[PDB]
Every structure is written in structure tokens, then in C-alpha cells.
Amino acid sequence: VSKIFFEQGTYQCLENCGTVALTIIRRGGDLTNTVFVDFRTEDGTANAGSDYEFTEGTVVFKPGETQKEIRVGIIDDDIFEEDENFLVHLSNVKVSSEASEDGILEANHVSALACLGSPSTATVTIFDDDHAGIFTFEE
Ligand SMILES: [Ca+2]
Ligand SMILES: [Ca+2]
Numbered sequence: 001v002s003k004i005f006f007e008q009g010t011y012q013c014l015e016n017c018g019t020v021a022l023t024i025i026r027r028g029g030d031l032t033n034t035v036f037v038d039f040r041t042e043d044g045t046a047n048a049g050s051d052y053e054f055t056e057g058t059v060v061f062k063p064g065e066t067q068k069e070i071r072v073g074i075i076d077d078d079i080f081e082e083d084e085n086f087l088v089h090l091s092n093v094k095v096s097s098e099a100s101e102d103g104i105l106e107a108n109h110v111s112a113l114a115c116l117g118s119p120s121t122a123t124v125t126i127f128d129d130d131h132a133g134i135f136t137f138e139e
Pocket of ligand 1: 046050078
């Protein structure tokens with residue numbers, strides 16, 4: 001069993017940072033079986049593929065991967081950007097226990113089969129900082 005979840009619920013980075021590194025924490029004791037969780041960024045209040053990247057991929061939790069790090073590319077849009085953020089959601093949990101990709105309901109999963117130990121919403125608030133005369137609106 002492995003609960004996959006974001007270390008933080010909100011991540012902030014500069015637009016000029018290049019990438020934002022998020023960390024997924026994995027709990028459940030010990031588990032060396034390879035757990036796969038699929039992720040993508042959500043447009044939220046912006047556009048993925050226009051403002052910042054969608055970094056759609058799958059996180060491979062290998063033996064030793066008690067934590068995983070993902071990075072979202074920031075795209076060069078320079079618009080007056082006020083609290084321009086997106087949401088990272090996790091979905092599609094698949095477990096490699098057998099040598100086949102389709103692990104038939106194998107008990108080395110997240111919860112029941114799949115779930116996530118977060119909203120799951122890792123809000124990535126990009127600090128444009130260029131025209132960012134932002135106001136703190138609570139999420
Ligand atoms: Ca933007
Ligand atoms: Ca900007």
C-alpha cells in the first residue's frame with residue numbers, strides 16, 4: 001500500500017524560475033513495488049500550454065522512491081499576471097507488481113485501488129513578479 005500525495009498544497013515559484021519542483025510524498029510503511037500515478041496541470045485561471053506547461057506524465061515510484069519530484073515548465077508569457085496559478089491534480093493509479101502493465105487489483109495500491117492523499121490539488125502560484133501587483137485572495 002502506498003499513499004501518494006503532495007508534500008505541499010501550494011507551491012510558489014517565479015515565472016522566470018523555469019520550472020517549479022513539487023514533491024510527492026509516499027507513505028504506507030515500506031513498498032518497493034512500482035506504483036504509477038499520472039499527473040497533469042490544470043488550466044485553473046490560466047492556460048496550460050500557453051502560460052505554463054502542463055507537464056503531463058506519469059510518476060514512477062520505484063524502490064527507494066519514498067518521495068518523487070515533478071517539475072512544471074513555465075512558458076514565456078508576459079502578461080500582466082496577477083496571482084496567475086494552476087492546479088496540479090493526480091489521477092490514474094496503476095501498480096506494477098506483476099510483470100504485466102495491468103496489475104489486476106493488486107494489493108500494493110493506494111486505497112481500494114486508487115485514491116490520492118491530497119485534495120488533490122497542488123496549487124502552483126506563479127510569481128510573475130513583473131506586473132504582479134497582486135492581492136492575496138484566499139483559496
Ligand atoms: Ca502567464
Ligand atoms: Ca509575467
